[PDB]
């Protein structure tokens, strides 16, 4: 029952992070924490098992000097330490309880997601996309520091024929955009408006599309 | 060092079809030692199957598993919306502990052209001296398609980033964004642009073109 880790770390390169996994709804000192790691649109790769009651470790060799386990049974919380960060750290950190099924891995965290970057906040610049029965128009969103923004149109009142695809890191900034289909005979005589939020700069920017 | 093959790493099914996942092992695992894992994107994984054939809590029954040695599998009589997500094996009969590349599980639905739009650099983006044109390729089926850019009739590779979205979960289409960046003296030195999207609906191309100026 439960496992509450962090949602996101930001660390620079060369840098260490400590991300914290605490148990709740059982006996924590019965079941061992596995650490597993997963790169963007990637699969899984273990890091290391951690025995709770007694502290000792094993590694999967790959992370052995990149990863310390540890636990500390009187707050009912693993950790993993990542020493020496480079951009191929940056990945979704998982830990999950093994679990008396033969070591089966039956409890999970929602998951830590590092981002291994030397980056400043920096708010984004935001384009319209406006062409040269239905028309297709869009917003180009970049040059953004970090994830995520947010994008509607006609602040959502366009809800359906969106389309807001994922962000791209473009040097070490993000770039991403949006499009919207109407029809015809709505654009340009009602007004189609981006709505852009940038949470971390504490900006948003609106910007219409005109011919 | 046991390797887990998915094969293959990618399996379309429609809905009502029995499907299998297949886990393969380059030594022999002990049954009791191989489990399965379902993730969906954004989600953490989940507990699907363990040790083979035991369905794990709030499993559906129309999940099967069996296998032995080298040859496991996970079995769906009668595919459901719901079960489209990446599946993975893993093994514990050995150290160190690995998981197979994973199998996604996409629905299969009637194939469709992409609705292909290009866009020039807006003119706020040209007063920073960046220069950006965008092409969306949208709601088409299945994933596989190829993106061209020609800048005055010659193919650039240069300075282009892509991006999916994840199978539309209402209409089971993809869609695509395709971006080619250049300087503005870059953009002003030529003038005709084109995004060609190839894509197993048509022999030919779908075509988007203009001219700045």
């Known amino acids: 029952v439960k496992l509450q880790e962090s949602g996101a770390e930001l660390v620079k390169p060369g840098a260490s992070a400590k991300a914290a996994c605490e148990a709740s709804?059982?006996?924590?000192?019965?079941?061992?924490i596995h650490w597993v790691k997963q790169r963007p649109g990637q699969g899984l790769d273990w890091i290391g098992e951690?025995?709770?009651?007694?502290?000792?470790?094993n590694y999967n060799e790959r992370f052995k000097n990149k990863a310390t386990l540890t636990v500390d049974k009187t707050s009912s919380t693993a950790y993993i330490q990542l020493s020496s960060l480079t951009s191929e750290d940056s990945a979704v950190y998982y830990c999950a309880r093994e679990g008396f099924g033969n070591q089966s891995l039956d409890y999970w965290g929602q998951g830590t997601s590092l981002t291994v970057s030397s980056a400043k906040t920096t708010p984004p610049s935001v384009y319209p996309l406006a062409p040269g029965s239905m028309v297709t128009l869009g917003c180009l969103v970049k040059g953004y520091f970090p994830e995520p923004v947010t994008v509607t149109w006609n602040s959502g009142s366009l809800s359906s024929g969106v389309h807001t695809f994922p962000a791209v890191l473009q040097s070490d900034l993000y770039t991403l955009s949006s499009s919207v289909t109407v029809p015809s005979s709505t654009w340009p005589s009602e007004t189609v408006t981006c709505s852009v939020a940038h949470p971390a700069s504490s900006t948003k920017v609106d910007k219409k599309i005109v011919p | 060092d046991i390797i887990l093959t998915q094969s293959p790493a990618i399996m379309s099914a429609s809905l009502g079809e029995r499907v299998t996942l297949t886990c393969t092992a380059s030594?022999?695992?002990?049954?009791?030692?191989l489990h399965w894992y379902q993730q969906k994107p954004g989600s953490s994984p989940k507990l699907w199957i363990y040790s083979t054939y035991n369905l794990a809590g709030a499993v559906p029954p129309r999940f099967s598993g069996s296998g032995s040695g080298t040859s496991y599998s996970l079995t769906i009589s009668s595919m459901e919306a719901e079960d489209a997500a990446t599946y993975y094996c893993q093994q514990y009969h050995r150290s160190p502990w690995t998981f197979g590349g994973g199998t996604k599980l996409e629905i299969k639905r009637a194939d469709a052209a992409p609705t292909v739009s290009i866009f020039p650099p807006s003119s706020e983006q040209l007063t920073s001296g960046g220069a950006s044109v965008v092409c969306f390729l949208n709601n088409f089926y299945p994933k596989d398609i190829n993106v061209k850019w020609k800048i005055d009739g010659s193919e650039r590779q240069n300075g282009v980033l892509n991006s999916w979205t994840d199978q539309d979960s209402k209409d089971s289409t993809y869609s695509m964004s395709s971006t080619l960046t250049l300087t503005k003296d870059e953009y002003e030195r030529h003038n005709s642009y084109t995004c060609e999207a190839t894509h197993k609906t048509s022999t030919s191309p779908i075509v988007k073109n203009f001219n700045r100026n």
């Open positions: 951690i025995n709770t009651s007694s502290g000792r470790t």
């Open positions: 030594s022999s695992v002990s049954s009791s030692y």
């Open positions: 709804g059982y006996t924590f000192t019965s079941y061992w």
